[PDB]
Copies of this chain bind each other. A is one copy, B any other.
Amino acid sequence: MPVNLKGRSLDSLLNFTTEEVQHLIDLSIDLKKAKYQGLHINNRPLVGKNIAILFQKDSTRTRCAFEVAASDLGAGVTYIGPSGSNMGKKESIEDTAKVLGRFYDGIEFRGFAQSDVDALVKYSGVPVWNGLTDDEHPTQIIADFMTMKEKFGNLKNKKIVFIGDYKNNVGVSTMIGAAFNGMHVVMCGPDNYKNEIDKNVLAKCIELFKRNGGSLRFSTDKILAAQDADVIYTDVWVSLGEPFELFDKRIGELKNFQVDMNMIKAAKNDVIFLHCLPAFHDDHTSFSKEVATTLGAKYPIVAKGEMEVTDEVFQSLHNKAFDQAENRMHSIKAIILSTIGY
């Protein structure tokens, strides 16, 4: 049956065939190639359309990626920040979704609850796109593996390690991606952490690996993990907006999974480093200086501002985080185009 994403919402990537997901990634690349030639100047297929982008919490990368992709396509965009994006408080989300559907041809939404995305999908009647929830980061997934495909070509049987807080939405998304791409994933970090990943998500990925040809293995040894890894992907240890008592705990249980030059050269030569950013990889930020000062005793790794990754790795030819960053815009453009349709 035809890859036809016209009218679909991008709520969870798991609601999509392996073929539909490979389409999106391919289209992302094609659309990036077209822009470098200036083909977007005379060919703006969404003129006469508008999308709203809602953020219950600020996301500079995701908002800019939508703003630019929509704009390059010919669409008008209206950005609603946190002040205006709050849901179910002074109006039910059912009703907010039904109105947005009367004004706009597509709705982007970034908030904590997947149920909120769900109501948005059910009641608006237009394509809804998940800009990031507690459960998932679908647009970033596409950007991530598009980045990998540009580097290595077909991804089947290539190996990727998500090290760090792998039970969180990025980590779980990365696993989802690898499943669709038939890659060997190694979720590397604390052992306890596996136990907190939705059991339905795992099942689907495990089928996906069967069908597409990867594997899902867990791991506690950073250097073991990196063996023949083509890709090493990590993420912050600390969520912004919580107490140091919870920092203490978190950096404690993760302090052995910092990505450093050992881990990199323990992998392949042409291994690439991914991170969705921001990353704390030195002391250039006040938040960094803060952590390295108040906990730079109790823990030597953070003593230099660095947490999930060493400035040495971050400044190395291995780091593709910035290409990955640019690709947020190209892949979101593929999502909007396929769903709204030319």
Interface of A toward B, CB cutoff 8 Å: 1-2, 4, 6-7, 23, 26-27, 30-31, 33-34, 36-43, 45, 47-48, 50, 52, 58, 60-61, 63-65, 67-68, 71-72, 76, 78-84, 88-96, 98-104, 123-126, 153-154, 156, 211, 213, 240, 269-270, 277-279, 282, 284-288, 317, 322, 325-326, 329, 337, 341-342
Contacts and interface: CB of A to CB of B under 8 A. Distances in A.
B33 A30 contact: yes
A37 B41 contact: no
A1 B101 contact: yes
B284 A102 contact: no
B78 A1 contact: no
A142 to B, nearest CB: 15
A279 B286 CA distance: 36
13 contacts: A1-B125, A6-B7, A27-B36, A30-B33, A39-B43, A41-B45, A41-B48, A60-B80, A61-B99, A89-B285, A89-B287, A90-B285, A213-B269
Given A102-B326, A326-B103, A342-B37, A279 B95 contact: yes
Given A38-B43, A95-B279, A103 B65 contact: yes
B37 A50 contact: no
Residue of A99, A126, A282, A329 contacting most chain B CB atoms (<10 Å): A99
Contact of A92 (B123, B282, B341): B282
A99 B37 CA distance: 21
Contacts of A50: 67-68, 71-72
B101 A84 contact: no
A37 B153 contact: no
A209 to B, nearest CB: 12
